[PDB]
Amino acid sequence: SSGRIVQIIGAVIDVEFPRDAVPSIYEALKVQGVETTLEVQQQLGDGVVRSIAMGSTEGLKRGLNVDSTGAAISVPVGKATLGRIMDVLGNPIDEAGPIGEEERWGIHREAPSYADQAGGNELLETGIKVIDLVCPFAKGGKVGLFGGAGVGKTVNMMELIRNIAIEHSGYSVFAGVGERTREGNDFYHEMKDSNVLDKVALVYGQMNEPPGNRLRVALTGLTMAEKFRDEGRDVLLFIDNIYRYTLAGTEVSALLGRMPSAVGYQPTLAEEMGVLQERITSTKKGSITSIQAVYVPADDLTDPSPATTFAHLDATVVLSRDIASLGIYPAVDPLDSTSRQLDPLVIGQDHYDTARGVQYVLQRYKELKDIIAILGMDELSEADKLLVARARKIQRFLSQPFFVAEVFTGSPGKYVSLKDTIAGFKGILNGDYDHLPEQAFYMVGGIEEAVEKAKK
Amino acid sequence: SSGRIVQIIGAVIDVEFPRDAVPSIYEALKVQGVETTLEVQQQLGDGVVRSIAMGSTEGLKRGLNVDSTGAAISVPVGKATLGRIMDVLGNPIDEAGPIGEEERWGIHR
Amino acid sequence: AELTTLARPYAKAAFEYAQAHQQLADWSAALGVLAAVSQDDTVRQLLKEPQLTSSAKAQSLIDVCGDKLNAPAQNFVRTVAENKRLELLPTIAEMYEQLKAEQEKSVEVEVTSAFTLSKEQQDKLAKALSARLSREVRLHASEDASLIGGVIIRAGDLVIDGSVRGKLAKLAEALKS
Amino acid sequence: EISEIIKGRIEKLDVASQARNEGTIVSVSDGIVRIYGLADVMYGEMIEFPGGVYGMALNLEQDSVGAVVLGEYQGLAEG
Numbered sequence: 001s002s003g004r005i006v007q008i009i010g011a012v013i014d015v016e017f018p019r020d021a022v023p024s025i026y027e028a029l030k031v032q033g034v035e036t037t038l039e040v041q042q043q044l045g046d047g048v049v050r051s052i053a054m055g056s057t058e059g060l061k062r063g064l065n066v067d068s069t070g071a072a073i074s075v076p077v078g079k080a081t082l083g084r085i086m087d088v089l090g091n092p093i094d095e096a097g098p099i100g101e102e103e104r105w106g107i108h109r110e111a112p113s114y115a116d117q118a119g120g121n122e123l124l125e126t127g128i129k130v131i132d133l134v135c136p137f138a139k140g141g142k143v144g145l146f147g148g149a150g151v152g153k154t155v156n157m158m159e160l161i162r163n164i165a166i167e168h169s170g171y172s173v174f175a176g177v178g179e180r181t182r183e184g185n186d187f188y189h190e191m192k193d194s195n196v197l198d199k200v201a202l203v204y205g206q207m208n209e210p211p212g213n214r215l216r217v218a219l220t221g222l223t224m225a226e227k228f229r230d231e232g233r234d235v236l237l238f239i240d241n242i243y244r245y246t247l248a249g250t251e252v253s254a255l256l257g258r259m260p261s262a263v264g265y266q267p268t269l270a271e272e273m274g275v276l277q278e279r280i281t282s283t284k285k286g287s288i289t290s291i292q293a294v295y296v297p298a299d300d301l302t303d304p305s306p307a308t309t310f311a312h313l314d315a316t317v318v319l320s321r322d323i324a325s326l327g328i329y330p331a332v333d334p335l336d337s338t339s340r341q342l343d344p345l346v347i348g349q350d351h352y353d354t355a356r357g358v359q360y361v362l363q364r365y366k367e368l369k370d371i372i373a374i375l376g377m378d379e380l381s382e383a384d385k386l387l388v389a390r391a392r393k394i395q396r397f398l399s400q401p402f403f404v405a406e407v408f409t410g411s412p413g414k415y416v417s418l419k420d421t422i423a424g425f426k427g428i429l430n431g432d433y434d435h436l437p438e439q440a441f442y443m444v445g446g447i448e449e450a451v452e453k454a455k456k
Numbered sequence: 457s458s459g460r461i462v463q464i465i466g467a468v469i470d471v472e473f474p475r476d477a478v479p480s481i482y483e484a485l486k487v488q489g490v491e492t493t494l495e496v497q498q499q500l501g502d503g504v505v506r507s508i509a510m511g512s513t514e515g516l517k518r519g520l521n522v523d524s525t526g527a528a529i530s531v532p533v534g535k536a537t538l539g540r541i542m543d544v545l546g547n548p549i550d551e552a553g554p555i556g557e558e559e560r561w562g563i564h565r
Numbered sequence: 566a567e568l569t570t571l572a573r574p575y576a577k578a579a580f581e582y583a584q585a586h587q588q589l590a591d592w593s594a595a596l597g598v599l600a601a602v603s604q605d606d607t608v609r610q611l612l613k614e615p616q617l618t619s620s621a622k623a624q625s626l627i628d629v630c631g632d633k634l635n636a637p638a639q640n641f642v643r644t645v646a647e648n649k650r651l652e653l654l655p656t657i658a659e660m661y662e663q664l665k666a667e668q669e670k671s672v673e674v675e676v677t678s679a680f681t682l683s684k685e686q687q688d689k690l691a692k693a694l695s696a697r698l699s700r701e702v703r704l705h706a707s708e709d710a711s712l713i714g715g716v717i718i719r720a721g722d723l724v725i726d727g728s729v730r731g732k733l734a735k736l737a738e739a740l741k742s
Numbered sequence: 743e744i745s746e747i748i749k750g751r752i753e754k755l756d757v758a759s760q761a762r763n764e765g766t767i768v769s770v771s772d773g774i775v776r777i778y779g780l781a782d783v784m785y786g787e788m789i790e791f792p793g794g795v796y797g798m799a800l801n802l803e804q805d806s807v808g809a810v811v812l813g814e815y816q817g818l819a820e821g
């Protein structure tokens with residue numbers, strides 16, 4: 001049957017239906033005079049349901065008629081989504097006409113079972129020195145890029161999109177959850193001009209959008225990736241910012257009648273994160289390699305949202321504002337960043353010992369910072385002086401000019417193999433480069449280029 | 457018209473007035489038979505206003521009569537205020553007699 | 566807070582006065598009239614107006630009921646209005662009847678079957694329930710084609726299911742679990 | 743069921759009909775106003791008060807409308 005709007009407060013709307021026709025949780029509803037879509041969140045009793053609007057509520061009023069659709073928000077899936085741009089409800093937003101869909105899938109699903117899990121450990125080379133050394137990625141695994149405002153999350157993601165597509169031959173799915181509309185336009189035209197667009201599905205719900213859109217766009221993109229995984233394919237799933245899915249949930253939580261938790265967050269923070277994160281996994285049918293940018297509120301890694309995200313990832317890349325301030329890009333922190341693949345049984349003893357050696361030197365240099373700041377380097381022991389000199393070279397050799405960062409500086413981009421990465425850091429640890437000047441390691445790709453830069 | 461005290465909680469006093477005589481926000485009210493001035497802060501509805509007492513509430517009780525003054529706290533202004541000590545309501549706290557005022561102005565503008 | 570939580574003090578006060586003065590049937594009629602009259606589309610509107618006083622709302626409701634409210638019942642309506650509780654009148658009447666039924670050792674039992682049952686069967690179910698519950702039973706018999714066969718008994722919060730639909734559901738859960 | 747004599751008494755009652763575009767103020771506090779009866783008001787609509795003052799509709803509830811005053815609220819009163 002149909003119901004009537006009884007209350008409106010921002011993005012949240014209450015609708016009353018006959019007692020024998022009350023709609024189900026997550027069921028989609030449509031307002032008769034404007035065609036605005038609503039998603040049911042809870043049943044309040046007496047035939048009243050509470051819902052979130054999937055669009056603007058300006059101009060809506062009490063007493064308007066509402067139609068129940070009998071199902072959840074359903075989006076098109078399969079080959080017809082490749083090279084197309086869609087919104088949260090699966091409508092095309094690229095002016096290229098209707099989607100030639102064969103079937104539609106509901107955006108709400110349970111995670112794959114414990115018996116469906118995949119045990120993959122195959123190494124994925126990124127061509128970026130710091131990542132390949134201390135944060136080795138794996139095919140079918142999950143990666144997270146943590147960082148404050150303006151430190152490198154989008155630039156480091158655009159560089160990873162460029163490098164992984166060299167070896168990967170399958171499809172990709174990109175979900176834009178609460179970020180800049182200009183960056184979605186730049187990425188679409190870049191792929192269209194490069195002829196890469198026919199193998200990528202694009203979904204957007206940017207910062208300009210109301211809370212309901214930003215809250216469900218992640219589910220729409222993941223539903224398209226799950227169709228390709230379940231077809232037996234190996235696909236890439238990229239998320240512009242997973243924190244926006246949680247934040248859109250915070251804006252609406254008090255309107256849903258929930259008591260707040262620590263620092264104003266919704267009481268359901270960890271469950272809302274687990275329900276989405278557990279679906280983003282590889283199975284015995286096919287694989288999903290996923291990369292996500294994670295905003296860190298006010299540079300605080302102990303904040304409830306970032307703190308709850310670390311347990312859902314295989315590789316954690318932590319960006320720092322202190323490192324970015326020195327000039328080093330990518331601004332990765334070797335001591336805070338880590339990966340499940342950093343194991344002697346997965347990467348071999350040579351890589352493992354080189355990575356452990358780099359971390360030991362950088363940790364010891366971090367302990368001397370206060371002594372060096374008050375008394376200077378000259379008071380240190382003959383052993384500490386040599387270690388600090390190698391720490392400064394290692395810290396500079398971790399830098400690398402990117403093929404997407406060329407517009408910012410002018411310098412050409414560099415791709416460094418895992419073999420060249422291990423050889424350079426092993427030589428600096430052994431002392432094979434103790435004679436070269438500290439500035440020769442800054443922005444040079446492979447170790448041989450540091451030898452040529454020292455000639456000037 | 458006049459209102460009645462309905463609730464007293466420290467310095468906060470709620471006063472009930474007839475529906476056609478509810479006093480405005482910031483209006484000054486006088487308690488009958490006691491030298492106590494109340495400033496209206498909020499209109500709660502049902503003819504009830506919430507106010508703050510400009511002095512001690514000790515000895516007050518529910519049901520005392522209150523009179524509206526028609527304006528905000530109005531204080532003496534001009535030449536007569538020079539060389540004098542006054543309280544928040546413009547009363548002469550010095551033992552020098554009444555202020556030779558020619559005009560009074562409301563404190564809110 | 567449920568409406569039942571707010572109506573409890575008022576329903577209990579009305580019941581104890583009616584019981585002590587031997588007026589149980591008078592208050593049963595008075596509360597029923599107030600519950601029905603306050604739900605009328607014109608009276609429901611009048612009671613929600615922000616310009617009317619509690620005494621004006623009470624007097625208007627008393628003048629409309631008139632003959633059906635004795636002096637105690639009129640005093641009760643003026644008490645419910647002063648405390649701003651006129652929206653609870655339908656719940657107060659419902660809770661008063663529950664206190665009355667429990668006092669008068671009476672139980673209203675709903676009954677449903679696939680197809681009609683004889684007076685011989687109703688009187689056999691009635692004596693069995695009255696012997697189990699130790700109360701007077703009033704069987705509100707009815708039919709529901711959703712049942713494949715048999716009958717279901719609902720004596721308030723207590724339910725006794727002897728229907729074929731319940732047995733088929735037990736089998737579905739036994740095989741699925 | 744309500745009786746025909748009582749239904750006749752109900753039809754005689756002094757119940758004021760209110761237009762769907764008009765309302766009455768219930769309360770005023772710190773630039774926020776509560777209004778009773780604006781049945782056809784839209785979320786984000788401009789509300790007109792006496793003396794040239796305007797409000798914006800933010801909370802549309804079952805029994806009342808919550809509005810934020812687009813200027814000085816100290817001249818607004820209950821009723």
Ligand SMILES: Nc1ncnc2c1ncn2[C@@H]1O[C@H](COP(=O)(O)OP(=O)(O)O)[C@@H](O)[C@H]1O
Nearest residue numbers: 147148149150151152153154155329330405408
């Ligand atoms: N690899 C890099 N090389 C040079 N500058 C960089 C690099 N990464 C980031 N920056 C600088 O930092 C700015 C912000 O980077 P961006 O990726 O947009 O940050 P975030 O997405 O974390 O807010 C860039 O516009 C640029 O000036």
Ligand SMILES: [Mg+2]
Nearest residue numbers: 150153154155
């Ligand atoms: Mg950016």
